[PDB]
């Protein structure tokens, strides 16, 4: 058995040498080649390192690595890492019994990324949904840097707890986060109130919408 | 049978041309620790020309 | 098991060239330790390093004996020899051949050794060995006597090595006439007269002399 | 192709002459191709038959 | 050169710690690996210490030591001395010019051994030797611990006039000594005397055989 073990995450400032490690459990790292594959959220993995020292065309020369024979482990380093290099990496090897084993993956997090502000947006129910005898508020959140952002809902004059559903924030294509909030209610309750407000909690700021169903 | 070899970072470069390449001297001496040949065979060295 | 055995001429003439041969078994010279040395030991003194030789030609001799020691090796017979020209009377010592571990970081670890032989370089009073039997309760005792032998490395045995319980040997001594003497006895019960007769065996290595007597 | 290596299948390294059509050769003698005899053992310039 | 130096002999009671030091008269002793070897009486030398702090298999844990370049002395300690440890020891190192040098040797003697009385054994010349116009008496001495044992010969009225040879005592493999004596004479003298005896002298005791050739 050749079980490659990877750390959970690693962080380092850009424009430097960011090194990712990957250790093997047993066997022999010199018997089979070690490969590294880059995978981003919502996309298929892509080959980066093969034959433990080679790199295919189109990949920037920043991607490199070496094999440590003293500890039978693999390593991946980025000479001059930048914001676009923020993605997952998986070390892969092979067993002597012709068995391919993939690593656990390590989440690379760029520490040098600046702060950001959440783009709170609330959409009221449309005419089609009201004709369908239902209603659901959509409180979209985007462009927020921290992952500890929570959601909140407010009625016309007091807090309210309806059938609220909150999406888990995940990475975007531009290395930022995105989320969404839902609040379903009957049209009679929607018409029986003068306004509804979605509250988003951010680290050092907060934004409310206060959208009114009438006028 | 030279008196001093150069270092590995400045290894010496020598070219052989216009001479009979009698490879029997290394067989007559044979003090080597290891001997390997690639592409050509050690038996047919004297039978080929380059 | 890795075993080494010394061999060669046991009698050398003064001011002549000494020669010895060491036999290696259980390993290959070219791969095992890559080096095989000679060590001599005077009677009652310590060991004295002579020199080792590598199968590729690397040699290192003793500075005190550089002009006399000559060492060669055979890369096929797994045997190496030792030469010593211009010998003196004081060079009489018990020579040995051993191996040196070099596959490590540095040269060290004289692990295995041979059996040794007392090479004599004196040519005076050179004679052949002679044997004489000795005259022999619930137990009995008897022995055999060996005298008139100048070469020291002699070997003795009892009943061809079968049932050697009670066999004891005594050190030799050099007589004033120039010949050594050896005595060995064995203790056996009185009821052992039925089988396993009390045969004493001798073997003179420098001359291949073998005599069997009771 | 066992995981620890399948050494049951062997091929002849070299021989003094090429094989004839349908000529089976099961000789296990140590093949020698140097300037010195090998005496049936794998010396510094000796090759195994298989 | 790399001439080492050892004390010629050392003695200590059993069940105690023994301190043995071998000094290098020339060259730094720590420049190369120092080894220790043991040679029991009538046996080949055996490796005891290698790499200056390591011990091979089969050797008891009573052997250990270290090297100090500041005092050019090879330290060696023998914890729990016993009878079987009575043997010679040799320190060996290597010169900078690849010249191996062995020490002068050290005889470790177990002083706490009990006293032992010498055994006497004598054999008269047989007829097979008398037929060759010669005769030789063989006397045997053993089982004696002290080296002050001497020899003596008499012929029924006084010591023997013929030449007598005495063997040099040496240690056996069982922590005891061994010796012998020889007396050469003509068969006419062997027949013309009444009796011969091999006298062994010990501290406060003496044992003789007094073998009679006639009757």
XYZ file of N, CA, C and O in Angstrom, chain A residues 96-97, chain D residues 2-3:
16
model
N 2.680 -1.072 -6.144
C 3.387 -2.117 -6.874
C 2.440 -3.143 -7.481
O 2.834 -3.863 -8.405
N 1.207 -3.228 -6.986
C 0.199 -4.118 -7.545
C -0.674 -3.438 -8.594
O -1.817 -3.865 -8.794
N 3.907 -10.435 -11.316
C 3.598 -10.416 -9.895
C 4.019 -9.070 -9.331
O 4.928 -8.426 -9.869
N 3.375 -8.609 -8.254
C 3.754 -7.304 -7.688
C 5.191 -7.253 -7.204
O 5.833 -6.202 -7.323
